[PDB]
């Protein structure tokens, strides 16, 4: 068997972050940290699944807390965002549980499919798969932490500043009052307690991580797939000015076909996650873009909103762009195959060129759409159209302005 | 001749539900229950056509009843839905009469085209065609009955509750008063009578069945077509790791071409029904989605509206998804044909791959659009755009709220 | 030389209606009635060009009259329709002058290209080209005459009824007063005179004829091209169950390529006309659809408005559908070519199938769009979106209602 | 080495205008005027880069001047255009600096790629590359000068006329007062001085040139690329009725492939410039189209607005049309290759036809969209949709009308 310890494989590149996601109980797999991917299994009776049940239960408590709170105070387009957030996180937990069920099969086919690319004539690029996944994961994790850190600073400063500069109701600032104030939707159903207070803080942070891991997981998966397609393209580039034997083209076509089979298998497994992530990002991007003209009290509120908005747009763009790289990388070998000399031309090149030319090699949201650069352009155009129409809806609330600080 | 009694054919799978539709006189064919499809004929002078005339006449009476009533009370965007419903049902009767005229030719070509798939190397799947059609038909029929049952319960409870809790005009509840109240558009033109009262109830239920059978018929037809394409794909999957003789690929291509010819014949026959169903579903989905924010008096009204809305959206989605399965199943054999070894490669595979790759094998609305997964995504995007623009129109009536119960 | 007298050619099919258009000086060609198309020439110094100059001068007089009138009374979205109409008629005159300049070459290439289809193995269909063109042209001309007659009847009845039922300002009805009232935009610049009155009536009729003849000419050209494409399709259908020699396929491919070259030439010649017709039809359809909910005084006004709207929508739809018939007929031979046996298969069939599959054989608006059924569906969707957005603009004037009769 | 002095090369055609752009420090390249393109180099320590720093610094001063001014007086959808203009110009400077970095590589591959087309069997067209670039450049430069000349005349006349016909505040007209009045956003931050006054005038003119050179540069680049594709098409047209040796098709395919490689290299280098130009043009076209119904005081204001609007729309259209000519010219050789006789048919023609047919040979905005005629149609449709929705936003300000002259 191959030595999985040091090979540049996808499983080695993502397991550190898959295990990290298991800390918040995202995808409950057993033995995800094993060097051999064949040891990865899904078991309902396991510690990872138990933690997932705890997080799903507690997340449902927050969802019910928000649901009951909104009913008491009425449901408006601005309060509905909170309910959608918890609903999306709960859907993510379910989607990732199903993805956990299919992962052992996916990782097994992925490993045996990518073994040929770990040996010549394929060469490891300047930035290996582990480094590519780490940079994307750390960037998303780092930006997500800053986004949540700004959220807490913005909420805390707004709370304290309102009390301090009130010349009115004082309610001396404290951790207890802040929790009952900013998280009223929770404590309006459950009795307050410092133990519960920190639990809500941790689980809201966990919900934030889950909301961000959907996009991160798609990025790491996209990085792993476009990594091998790039290697195929690099190998083809080595044949630009040479007479190529028909055997070489047979291997290239077979490896390309195997990669396409793996993408189809991975696409089917992740079809629901892509669909959930795309709709979740579209709603929040549209929702946030509708509040760009709204007036906020403190500069920190502006900093958080624009950091949150830019990060959300950037995260959405890079999910599509990283996924679209699979499509772009597949078509990059076409330009070199078209330069094949007349003597080297054979049926295998004709077969390969036809497949690259006519096949859409990309991840898809249940085949309803394919993650390509054209789709991201279409998504941007769709968002602009929605915002132009939706901004008329928000004109009344926009002109009301910010409410009095004391009130 | 083949033994049609026990063969797994399309005619056997749909005739039980085609006959059921003939009870409400949808598609007036003679001998639809015959085991031999060659005995199915269309005759104007026949009992099925007579019943169709009766239902068409009575449905026209309801259409005129609604038309005259709206003129007396004015036509608004909310009352126009009732006129569209009866107009769509009448169009369905005409469309199905024309489809009845073409059915004998369609069922004859369908039967002789699918005979090859009833014998090896084609194998019956886990769920045969009869079971696939039954599950779809019973699900649609069962959901449609619940949708109408909720409509009657919602209407009856609203009627009785308004009278009971009025402390005002009493008009002691009775079957007679309910009929004159909720169905005023009928009795405002025809004299009331208990015999007419039940007739309106039955024919409105029949109109509901016809409105739902348009989508059901497209589903059963789509199930029958994707059934054979799936068998072709399954047969191709049996050749993944084998050296295939050129004769095998000749048969596969010929059977695939014959299936494509049948789809073209079926698509032309059903082009009007698909077009009518799509426009009918689009209007009602858009109309109902415009009333999600409206306030209803009783919880039963909310239950009916959301059951009606979700069922309508689900029915529309599954019509497109079931029809799109023909397109998806055609492209599923491409992945296996691309794995054909270099020795097994021949002109027949090249011909077949080119046809699968470049031909759009799907049902179409008069070729204006093709029922694919991309179209359903486009339909959803179009509906969202219309609702965002149309919700501005409905804002005034939305803020008026529900009227006083007694008034 | 071939006997042009009795051959089933496009020039024989269209020259009667081209001469009828010349009677209103649309396309000023010399010898359009000649049996030999080679005798058709474009000359600036000719009677047709003189009549075209006269009609253009008078149409410009009407356009300036409307422009000055609107400037005096202000320009509104409702008043701009007449200025757009006159500008479109003038643009049609210019475009048809250019098309006349290009027409000798177009007709010569068309004649030398369609000669092969006048002899076996091609057969004249049930409805020959002359009959198809006659049916289309007579339908369009009769509908346009009915539309203009309804317009005149509606205007005259409105005027006379306003005068008679006024119990107020009388201005006893007369031809002079009617002309000065309904055509004030003309006589507000030129002195009134009965000669000028009848001239204005005749020239407005001519403008209507030109506006309809743009679409009529597009229809006749589309019929002429789809005729030969259908002949090719029928010849291919004649080979469904036969072993075909390579020479037959060579001839079929050569004829198809010649037809495609002719289509490219005709599209280059008529791109400006197609673009102008499409934009004019889109604008007028949107404008008329924006007035469906408006309230008109007399039933004759409703009859005229709805006849005009339905005729305009049907004319646009039939222009698009007749043009897309070329694409449909080009693609219809693919189904039969795909059934070619393995023994009859050769390089020529592969070339022909590739051309039919990958080439878009259709008329285009300067290549910005191609007249296909997908394009008609997209046009319908775009019109729906534009109407949904614009009905908000017209809500105020819609709720203002009809003005007092006497006022 | 080839004699670059008199050869009809791209570098010779554009360097006169690239050098002119360097006067306003657009693309800081060293030795752009050298006959040999290999002498063109990019150096940060050079005079062209120094001038770019000066213009970038001063443009940033104007951007800050506008930014601070808007904050003092509030940011509105009408005031934001000025900030976008300076932001786009600054982005253009950065984009062109990066393009300057890549230009030496681009011009080197471009020169060696186009050498084959300077010798038979390729012939220089009626209008050589230098003439084609000159006509486009002079037209854009000439129209841009008129657009700015009208802007200054419109601003000066409005300023003087307001003072002269005021019967109120006089502030006798002078150069000093005009600068402090129309350019208050600058002098509200910097002290006024006649030296600064002219500097602002020159740099605003330079900013206008930079805003127009983005489109001009794309045009000249598009002209250079479609020039060689047209030569390939012309060479193929020379083989319409001849028996062609396989060697000829090898050369044609190799030259076509080399041209496609050059387009890919050029497209990647100019991907950011195309993206910036498209978004900049879309915003300004949409912004200006929103003010067509606004009322301006003097006719000169109307002349400037409509000259500015028509030029902006025309410039945007011709950028897309000139770029789309690369796509159109690539597909023009297909029609002749399809006429290749059966004896001349070979694998090379099949390879070439497949590439022309299936490859999208066009410039792209980072592959998000391709500059084709379909895209320009889509752009026009998108603009119409935005304007219809956005015109509702601008209705309030539209009905306010022009403010009092004295006020
Ligand atoms: O469901 C509302 C709930 O979300 C919280 C949880 O901490 O904030 C998260 O969700 C927001 C979007 O709804 C994000 O903007 C934010 O970054 C994220 O932390 C709370 O704001 C709220 O209680
Ligand atoms: O035409 C209005 C008419 O439709 C009825 C007939 O029973 O209800 C049917 O049509 C509704 C949509 O218009 C559906 O929501 C409903 O499920 C269906 O039964 C009556 O409501 C009405 O008289
Ligand atoms: O330009 C306005 C002018 O058009 C007239 C001329 O008879 O009517 C023609 O144009 C209308 C659309 O603007 C059509 O509806 C009508 O069918 C056609 O006759 C007059 O209405 C008007 O003076
Ligand atoms: O940034 C606003 C600034 O642009 C100026 C600079 O002269 O005018 C240029 O920009 C306008 C669009 O914003 C163009 O219409 C105009 O043609 C161009 O000269 C000034 O108007 C203004 O100070």
- Overall SS class of chain A: mainly alpha
**Share of β-strand residues of chain A:** under 5%
Q: Any idea how many domains of chain A?
A: 1
Most extensive interface, chain pair and sizes = C-D, 24 and 22 residues
Oligomeric composition of the shown chains: homotetramer
The N- to C-terminal Cα distance of chain A equals 70 Å
- The proportion of residues forming helix of chain A, as a percent range, comes to over 70%
Number of helices of chain A: 14
Main β sheet profile of chain A = none
Q: How does the overall form of chain A come out from the CA principal axes?
A: elongated
How do the SSEs of chain A run, as a string of H and E?
Answer: HHHHHHHHHHHHHH
Number of strands of chain A: 0
Report the radius of gyration of chain A as a whole number of Å: 25 Å
| Cofactors, ions, other ligands | a molecule of 2 linked components (GLC-FRU)
Which features does this protein show?
homotetramer, 407 residues, mainly alpha, 0% strand
Q: Could you explain the architecture of this structure?
A:
- Chain A is an all-alpha fold and 407 residues long.
- Chain A has one domain.
- Helices cover 71% and strands 0% of the residues of chain A.
- The first copy, chain A, contains 14 helices and no strands.
- In chain A, helix 9 crosses helix 13.
- The longest helix of chain A has 44 residues.
- The termini of chain A are far apart.
- Chains in contact: A-B, A-D, B-C, C-D.
- Chains C and D meet through helix 8, helix 10 and helix 11 of C and helix 12 and helix 13 of D.
- Bound molecules: a molecule of 2 linked components (GLC-FRU) (4 copies).
- The site of a molecule of 2 linked components (GLC-FRU) has 12 residues of chain D, from helix 3, helix 4 and helix 7.
- It is classed as membrane protein.
- The entry lists the keywords gustatory receptor, Gr64a, sucrose, ligand-gated ion channel, membrane protein.
- It forms a tetrameric assembly.
- The cryo-EM structure of insect gustatory receptor Gr64a from Drosophila melanogaster in complex with sucrose.
- Chains A, B, C, D are Gustatory receptor for sugar taste 64a.
